[PDB]
Amino acid sequence: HHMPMYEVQWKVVEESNGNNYSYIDPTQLPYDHKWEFPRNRLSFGKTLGAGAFGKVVEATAQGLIKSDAAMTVAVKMLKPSAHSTEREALMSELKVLSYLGNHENIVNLLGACTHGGPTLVITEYCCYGDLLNFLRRKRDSFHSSDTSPASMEDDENALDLEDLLSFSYQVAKGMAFLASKNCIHRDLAARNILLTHGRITKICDFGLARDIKNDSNYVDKGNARLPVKWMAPESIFNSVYTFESDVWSYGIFLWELFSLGSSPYPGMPVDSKFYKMIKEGFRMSSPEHAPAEMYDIMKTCWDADPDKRPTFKQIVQDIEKQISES
Numbered sequence: 001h002h003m004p005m006y007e008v009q010w011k012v013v014e015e016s017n018g019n020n021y022s023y024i025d026p027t028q029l030p031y032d033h034k035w036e037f038p039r040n041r042l043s044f045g046k047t048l049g050a051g052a053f054g055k056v057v058e059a060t061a062q063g064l065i066k067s068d069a070a071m072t073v074a075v076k077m078l079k080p081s082a083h084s085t086e087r088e089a090l091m092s093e094l095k096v097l098s099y100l101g102n103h104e105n106i107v108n109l110l111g112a113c114t115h116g117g118p119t120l121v122i123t124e125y126c127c128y129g130d131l132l133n134f135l136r137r138k139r140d141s142f143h144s145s146d147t148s149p150a151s152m153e154d155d156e157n158a159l160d161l162e163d164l165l166s167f168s169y170q171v172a173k174g175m176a177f178l179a180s181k182n183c184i185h186r187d188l189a190a191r192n193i194l195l196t197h198g199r200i201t202k203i204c205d206f207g208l209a210r211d212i213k214n215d216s217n218y219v220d221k222g223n224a225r226l227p228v229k230w231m232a233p234e235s236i237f238n239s240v241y242t243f244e245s246d247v248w249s250y251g252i253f254l255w256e257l258f259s260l261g262s263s264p265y266p267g268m269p270v271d272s273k274f275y276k277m278i279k280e281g282f283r284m285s286s287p288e289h290a291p292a293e294m295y296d297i298m299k300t301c302w303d304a305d306p307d308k309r310p311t312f313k314q315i316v317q318d319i320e321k322q323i324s325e326s
């Protein structure tokens, strides 16, 4: 198994020579056994996602948070047909999670089971599932400002511009947190963002629990399956990944978000023509529902020069003001 064929692995970077950064080997990170949780105290429910070798299942965990209470969690784990490369990747994912620490806008580590049988990674459960398919289900229910509640069927569960601005803010905040821990996601997209109580968005990565070969958003390119339409030119062409290439992806996410889950670059299949156009400076237009200042963020996320892209910290400050001004 070449792991790039099955998932896009996030990376933690460290200072190298001069002003360069190098990837940390995640197997080198420690696993803090404070996270260890008794396997027997889990009760498995429905599958939330599965790929060739991995799955995520909804579970009930006894006494995870309060000694006397059960709580709903999501557990990531491997199928028995998985190879040692996948087993390593999952421990490595747990190590990075242990390293990162906690944030409101990421899917958080709650516990792990690492001895006896297969590695189980216990994370927060998000009741509304992935943001992409939520937007798509809610698309025809988008409520314009100053339109009557009676115009919608279930207006209390509809979607409006304040929701979209909120999601954009929350995702920027989670990515600012990642960048602050020297972490590069490398697969930011609406499919890797979840929605939960209070309409809180949490970044994640289904990873090995995604059927990647059947998701046409990943393209075979080299010895990998890559989310090309989300990727910065320097990542596609030179395999260079930085905090600024995550920013490009974030711009693409914003496009999906304000288009209510439409697919990026419609009428442009990934092929040599696609790559030529991206190099020449083709960029997507404003989505229907995107405010002009949000479209302005998009355009800057897609600067060919990574230095001219905003940082996540700037994006947060920018959207904060947009929300306040409304």
Ligand SMILES: FC(F)(F)c1ccc(CNc2ccc(Cc3c[nH]c4ncccc34)cn2)cc1
Residues within 6 Å of the ligand: 048, 049, 056, 074, 075, 076, 100, 105, 106, 107, 108, 123, 124, 125, 126, 127, 129, 130, 174, 178, 185, 194, 202, 203, 204, 205, 206, 207
């Ligand atoms: F935002 C971070 F921190 F970058 C980040 C956090 C976590 C990961 C990967 N771990 C996992 C674990 C389970 C899942 C699926 C998942 C978790 N909670 C759910 N709730 C409902 C449906 C699916 C799910 C996704 N990623 C990858 C990135």
